[PDB]
Amino acid sequence: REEEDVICDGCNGPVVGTRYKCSVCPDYDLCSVCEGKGLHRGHTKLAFPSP
Ligand SMILES: [Zn+2]
Ligand SMILES: [Zn+2]
């Protein structure tokens, strides 16, 4: 089967739990580790579940 997964654009790891999606850049997401490290603070991000 084909599945749609979310990959972190900061570290290339899986994004599980909460994803931090850029509201400006196309198709851009951070994992909680990279979000906590302060990546991509120059744009507003949307925080919502990444099941
Ligand atoms: Zn990451
Ligand atoms: Zn952005």
Author numbering: -3 to 47
Task: Provide passages from the article that reported this PDB entry.
Intriguingly, the autophagy adapter p62/SQSTM1/Sequestosome-1 was recently reported to recognize N-degrons, the N-end rule substrates of the well-characterized UPS, and where ultimately these substrates are delivered to ALS8,9. p62 is a key selective autophagy adapter that plays a role in the degradation of various cellular constituents such as misfolded proteins and their aggregates, malfunctioning organelles, and invading pathogens. Here, we present the high resolution structures of the ZZ-domain of p62 in complex with 8 different N-degrons including type-1 and type-2, and subsequently identify key determinants involved in the unusual recognition.
Using this fusion protein, we determined the complex structure of the ZZ-domain with R-BiP substrate at 1.45 Å resolution. As expected, the binding site of the ZZ-domain comprises a negatively charged patch for recognition of the positively charged N-terminal NH3+ group of R-BiP. The side chains of Asp129 and Asp149 in the ZZ-domain form hydrogen bonds with the α-amino group of R-BiP. Moreover, the key carboxylate of Asp129 which is involved in recognizing the α-amino group also forms an ionic interaction with the guanidinium group of the N-terminal arginine residue. Another negatively charged residue, Asp147, also participates in the N-degron binding, and in a manner that is not sequence-specific. The side chain carboxylate of Asp147 interacts with the main chain nitrogen atom of the first peptide bond between the first arginine R* and Glu19b of the N-degron. The main chain nitrogen atom of Ile127 also forms a hydrogen bond with the carbonyl oxygen of the first peptide bond of the N-degron. However, the side chain of Asn132 is re-oriented to form a specific interaction with the side chain of the N-degron. It is rotated 72.3° and moved by approximately 3.0 Å to facilitate recognition of the guanidinium group of the N-terminal arginine.
